[PDB]
């Protein structure tokens, strides 16, 4: 029950002879008589959520035990090619068996597969065989036994295998408890519920789970009727058209109104869009202080975060904030924004590898009435489906707050907190020379030389004046230092170590650890660094529903810089014993760039921002290769890459 295709179909997958059918038959035969649920009894059966996960070594052992039973020794093509393929299987399991397979990296066996001038171009079938072994056999085994989710952690290269039996038990328990305190049932909502339904996804947030709502591309009727494929396809394109022509414009106009307020109001400059911007605003604060009084004064600083900002978000305050940024447009205004494609466009109408080597605008138009209507609909009509354990899939709505995982949830929280910061902290932006406030999603930092204005901020985050917006200060996480030789002088803000005494800002970078660069060849270095890149390129850092583009870009830049730092560190050593070939390096760059763009489109479903990201990648790659004297042809090739038109 691992291979659900016949010998005729599998052999058809390996060509666009007779020994092949001999192997496929023996593999399929072993599949039918393999005692799967006895292996499960032998190998796979409290008080933090990740401890229930199967340890990775037991995960690997189960997979290889199945693979050994499924594939006879000749099916591996040698008693040593088996060692190589098994190592690539472990690498594939370290990516959760969910990332794209690269046949040029996995394949390092040579001849010993005796059908198990042109034998090489007719070895393209070996690519089709190994591909079927990895994507059909290995992946289905993982899907058969485990649910795989990446943790929300500090080090999020960690993928976790929960057996379906224990994952369902953990998930049903947390969801039942979370539904009582945050949700309320629904028996017949509006007929217009086609694009406001979502399914609950859980992420192992330490003591519990993060609750994410993934938008359903169907109506409830189509979801309950799993057999009406045509209707599901019809409504799938309804969402695609709704996302392209309605949701994307609404998000674009909200982002522009929010950007224009960063320049207009002084109260919105305190709202910062990324971590590097937090560092730069502090470094500029430090530098401007060194110019204003020529020394560095004793500085006081306070950091504080919000408790469950999405769950506790005030829907009414959010709706007022949205009306606020549109107060000047007289409720008949049409805005002109760009059109973008969907991921599922090229796929289902064209072919793969959408990054290739006359102009375009492709504008759309949307009115303020629609924007207000769609925003209200997303806030007030968002519903989620919960597994019932009587197999019923009831529908629930939020008592208060906004579901994380919908298109506008991230920008909703940005609009409200920018509005909140601007109206509530008025006594900060006529004396900017002495104090600095910065906002990053839900984390706040405030640095000042005025110990009196420190108490103003310290007394406002202790009152209830921010609860009007749904902001509740996480008091036990509040940290304050002053560096009067009586307190500590190091504080950790988001990703940053900040010295209170000298305003030194240094990045932790421990989230993505050592790229392990010590090899005797560039090919071995690029394969390892390709593994490292995909292992750290998690979906949440490409999620446009929860992060800004500057945050998405800087995260890609952070992974890139670590990857190229490995190249720079070991280039001289490897170049001593292996000649650097620029064309092999460009294929590595092309694979690295393609994977990032593909996963970004996969996560967000919309092509909005791939252009901005592709050119930020070119600039980052250019900068990161400054150490390389001879790169003109490499960089010239890099600059000719575009998104498929």
Q: How far apart are CA 49 and CA 57, in angstroms?
A: 19
Q: How far apart are CA 407 and CA 251, in angstroms?
A: 8
Q: What is each CA distance from 633 to 582, 591, 627, in whole angstroms?
A: 8, 17, 15
Q: How far apart are CA 224 and CA 228, in angstroms?
A: 10
Under 8 Å CB-to-CB from 631, ≥6 apart: which residues? 582, 625
Which residues in the chain have their C atom more than 2.5 Å from the N of the next written residue, marking a break after them? 16, 45, 116, 357
Q: How far apart are CA 289 and CA 449, in angstroms?
A: 10
* Backbone torsions φ then ψ of 234, nearest 5 degrees: -65, -50
Q: Please, is 399 exposed, middle or buried when counting C-beta atoms within 10 Å of its C-beta (0-12, 13-18, 19+)? A: exposed
Tokens (6 digits) for 607: 């092509």
Tokens (6 digits) for 158: 């960690």
What is 7-163's CATH topology? Topoisomerase I; Chain A, domain 4 (1.10.132)
Q: How far apart are CA 295 and CA 289, in angstroms?
A: 7
Tokens (6 digits) for 284: 């500029």
The C-alpha torsion from 351 through 119 and 83 to 516, rounded to 10°, is -60
Please state the separation of Cα 420 from the chain's center in Å. Answer: 27
For CA atoms 217, 220, 226, 229, the dihedral sign is negative
Q: How far apart are CA 597 and CA 611, in angstroms?
A: 9
Q: What is each CA distance from 388 to 164, 166, 374, 396, in whole angstroms?
A: 16, 16, 30, 11
Tokens (6 digits) for 612: 């901005």
Nearest to 538 by CA among 264, 158, 267, 168: 158
**DSSP symbol at 298:** P
SS3 track for 503-567 = CCEEECCCCCCCCCCCCCCHHHHHHHHHHHHHHHCCHHHCCCCCCCHHHHHHHHHHHHHHHHHHH
Angle at 67 between CA 66 and CA 71, to 5 degrees: 125
Q: Which strands, in side-by-side order, build the sheet including 490-493?
A: 490-493, 496-499, 505-507
Tokens (6 digits) for 634: 């490499």
Tokens (6 digits) for 286: 């430090």
Q: What is each CA distance from 215 to 233, 380, 488, in whole angstroms?
A: 16, 15, 46
Q: Give Rg (Cα) of the chain.
A: 27
For CA atoms 131, 133, 135, 136, the dihedral sign is positive
Tokens (6 digits) for 437: 């406030």
Nearest to 342 by CA among 521, 532, 607: 607
Nearest to 299 by CA among 507, 506, 498: 498
Paired strand residues for 148: 161
Which helix (H) or strand (E) segment holds residue 211: the answer is strand 210-215
Question: Tokens 């910062």 label which residue?
Answer: 272
How far from each other are the two terminal CA atoms of the chain, in whole angstroms? 42
SS3 track for 341-385 = CECCCCCCCCCCCCEECCCCCCEEEEEHHHHHHHHHHHHHCCEEE
Q: How far apart are CA 190 and CA 174, in angstroms?
A: 28
Question: Tokens 């009894």 label which residue?
Answer: 41
Tokens (6 digits) for 189: 């909502």
Question: Tokens 């109260």 label which residue?
Answer: 267
Q: How far apart are CA 495 and CA 505, in angstroms?
A: 10
Q: How far apart are CA 283 and CA 578, in angstroms?
A: 42
Other Cβ atoms less than 10 A from the Cβ of 613: the count is 20
Under 8 Å CB-to-CB from 99, ≥6 apart: which residues? 92, 534, 595
Nearest to 605 by CA among 30, 229, 214: 214
Q: How far apart are CA 193 and CA 383, in angstroms?
A: 8
Under 8 Å CB-to-CB from 21, ≥6 apart: which residues? 7, 11
Nearest to 419 by CA among 324, 328, 329: 324
Nearest to 298 by CA among 149, 474, 501: 501
Nearest to 610 by CA among 620, 624, 621, 596: 596
SS3 track for 247-289 = HHHHHHHHHHHHHHHHHHCCCCCCECCCHHHHHHHHHHHHHHH
Resolution of the structure, angstroms: 2.5
| 320 within 8 A of 469, measured Cβ to Cβ | no
Q: Please, is 117 exposed, middle or buried when counting C-beta atoms within 10 Å of its C-beta (0-12, 13-18, 19+)? A: exposed
| 186 within 8 A of 355, measured Cβ to Cβ | no
Q: What is each CA distance from 34 to 66, 68, 163, in whole angstroms?
A: 8, 11, 19
Give the 3-state secondary structure of residue 52: helix
DSSP for 595-636, written as a single string: HHHHHHHHHHSB-TTHHHHHHHHHHHHHHHTTT-SS-HHHHH
Nearest to 404 by CA among 571, 626, 129, 212: 212
Give the 3-state secondary structure of residue 107: coil
Tokens (6 digits) for 179: 């539904």
Other Cβ atoms less than 10 A from the Cβ of 463: the count is 9
Question: Tokens 């109408």 label which residue?
Answer: 349
């Amino acid at each position: 029950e691992i291979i659900r295709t016949n010998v005729q179909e599998v052999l058809a997958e390996i060509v666009s002879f007779r020994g092949i059918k001999n192997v496929v038959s023996r593999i399929i035969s072993n599949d039918k008589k393999c005692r799967y649920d006895l292996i499960y009894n032998k190998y796979l059966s409290l008080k933090t959520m990740i401890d229930y996960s199967t340890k990775f070594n037991r995960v690997v052992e189960v997979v290889l035990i199945i693979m050994g039973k499924l594939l006879p020794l000749d099916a591996w093509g040698g008693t040593e090619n088996k060692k190589v393929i098994q190592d690539r299987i472990v690498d594939f399991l370290r990516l959760g068996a969910n990332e794209r397979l690269h046949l040029d990296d996995v394949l390092s066996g040579i001849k010993l597969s005796k059908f198990k001038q042109d034998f090489q171009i007719r070895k393209r079938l070996l690519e089709g065989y190994i591909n079927w072994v990895f994507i059909s056999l290995v992946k289905n085994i993982v899907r058969a036994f485990w649910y795989v989710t990446e943790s929300s952690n500090m080090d999020r290269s960690k993928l976790f295998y929960f057996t379906h039996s224990i994952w369902n038990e953990l998930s049903s328990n947390w969801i039942t408890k979370y539904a009582k305190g945050n949700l309320v049932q629904v028996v017949s909502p509006e007929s217009k519920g086609q694009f406001t339904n979502g399914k609950i996804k859980l992420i192992p947030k330490r003591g519990g789970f993060r609750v994410i709502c993934v938008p359903l591309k169907q109506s409830l009727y189509s979801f309950n009727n799993k057999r009406n494929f045509a209707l599901k396809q019809k409504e799938k394109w309804d969402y695609i058209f709704y996302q392209k022509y309605t949701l994307s414009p609404v998000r674009q106009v909200l982002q522009l109104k929010l950007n224009a307020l960063r320049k207009s109001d002084m109260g919105h400059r305190s709202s910062v869009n990324s971590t590097n911007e937090v560092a730069d605003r502090i470094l500029t604060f430090r530098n401007d202080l060194l110019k204003k009084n020529k020394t560095l004064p004793v500085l006081y600083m306070i950091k504080f975060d919000m408790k469950e900002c999405y769950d506790r978000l005030n829907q009414n305050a959010l709706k007022e904030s949205i009306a606020g940024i549109f107060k000047e447009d007289n409720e008949n205004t049409t805005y002109h924004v760009r059109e973008y494609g969907t991921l599922d466009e090229f796929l289902k109408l064209k072919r793969v590898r959408t990054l290739i080597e006359v102009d375009k605008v492709k504008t759309l138009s949307i009115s303020k009435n629609k924007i207000i209507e769609v925003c209200h609909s997303q806030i007030e009509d968002a519903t989620c489906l919960v597994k019932n354990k009587e197999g019923q899939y009831d529908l629930f709505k939020r008592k208060q707050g906004v579901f994380q995982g919908f298109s506008l949830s991230g920008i909703f929280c940005d609009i409200l907190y920018s509005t909140m910061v601007s109206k509530e902290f008025k006594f900060l932006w006529e004396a900017t020379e002495d104090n600095l406030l910065l906002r990053l999603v839900d984390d706040f930092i405030f640095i000042t030389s005025n110990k009196d204005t420190l108490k103003k901020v310290k007394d406002k985050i202790s009152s209830n004046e921010l609860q009007k917006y749904g902001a509740f200060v996480n008091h036990e996480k509040t940290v304050e230092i002053n560096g009067e030789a009586g307190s500590s002088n190091k504080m950790t803000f988001v990703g940053l170590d900040i010295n209170c005494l000298t305003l030194d800002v240094k990045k932790d970078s421990s989230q993505f650890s050592r790229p392990t660069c010590k090899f005797r060849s560039f090919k071995a270095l690029f394969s390892n660094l390709k593994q490292f890149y995909c292992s750290n390129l998690s979906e949440f850092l490409l999620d446009f529903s929860s992060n800004s583009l500057e945050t998405i870009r800087e995260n890609v830049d952070a992974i890139l810089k670590l990857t190229f730092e490995a190249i720079q560190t070991s280039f001289a050593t490897i170049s001593k014993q292996d000649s650097f070939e620029r064309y092999r390096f460009m294929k590595f760059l092309h694979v690295i760039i393609e994977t990032t763009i593909e996963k970004f489109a996969r996560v967000n479903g919309s092509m909005e921002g791939v252009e901005y990201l592709l050119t930020c990648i070119k600039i980052t790659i250019t900068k990161s290769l400054a150490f390389m004297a001879t790169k003109q042809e490499i960089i010239e090739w890099l600059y000719t890459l575009t998104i498929v038109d």
